Structure formats: C-alpha cells, structure tokens
Amino acid sequence: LDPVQKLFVDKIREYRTKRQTSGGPVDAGPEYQQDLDRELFKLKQMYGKADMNTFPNFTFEDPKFE
Amino acid sequence: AGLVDDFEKKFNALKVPIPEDKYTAQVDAEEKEDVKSCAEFLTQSKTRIQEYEKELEKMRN
Structure with a gap:
C-alpha cells in the first residue's frame, strides 16, 4: 500500500522538503x-x-605521611 | 568532531606527570633509628655477650 506509503512518502517528501528546507525552528x-x-x-x-x-x-x- | 579530534589528539598525546611525595627523608629517619639498632645495641650486645658467655665457661669450672 502506497496511499499508506504515499503517506510514509508524504511525510518523507517532507523528510526532504523540510530537510532540504532546513528544519529546527525552521519549517517549523x-x-x-x-x-x-x-x-x-x-x-x-x-x-x-x-x-x-x-x-x-x-x-x-600527594597523600600524607611522616 | 573538531572537538572530538582536538581532544582525541590531546588524549592520544596526553601523558600525565606522576604524583608528589616528600617523606623520602623516611629513608634517612630510618638510618638514625638504623644506627640505634647498630651502635647502641649491635655493639653493646656483642660486648656484653662476649663477657657473659665467656663468663659461663670459667665459672662453669
């Protein structure tokens, strides 16, 4: 399933979209x-x-002696 | 990893001095109460042992 892994996709394309945006307080x-x-x-x-x-x-x- | 490598090279290079100590006068604080043993009772005792054990034979007679 790739409406499922379209969405694994769809977030992973924003794996790349954000990651190759920047990410941090960025895209965000x-x-x-x-x-x-x-x-x-x-x-x-x-x-x-x-x-x-x-x-x-x-x-x-040094520890102590006499 | 500049930090890692900085510290890495430093750690690879890093070789401690050794500790401090100071009571190697005890070596010689020995030699004093090292002659006490000697002089005082080394010699005293041989001297004393001589006359006494010798002092056994003649009065054993």
Missing part, C-alpha cells in the same frame, strides 16, 4: 529555539558547567 517557526537554548543549557547542567568543550587537565597530588 521560532518555537524550537525558545526551548532549545534552555534545553541545551540543561545539558550544561547534565554535565555541570564544567566546559564540555575544553580539554580537561588532571591532578598532581
């Missing part, structure tokens, strides 16, 4: 960004604000 309106900023900030919370985009450096350290 601002809405996405207005969350997006906050939701990706939550990801910043999900890692802590330890910059998930700077290569980390590492501890050089």
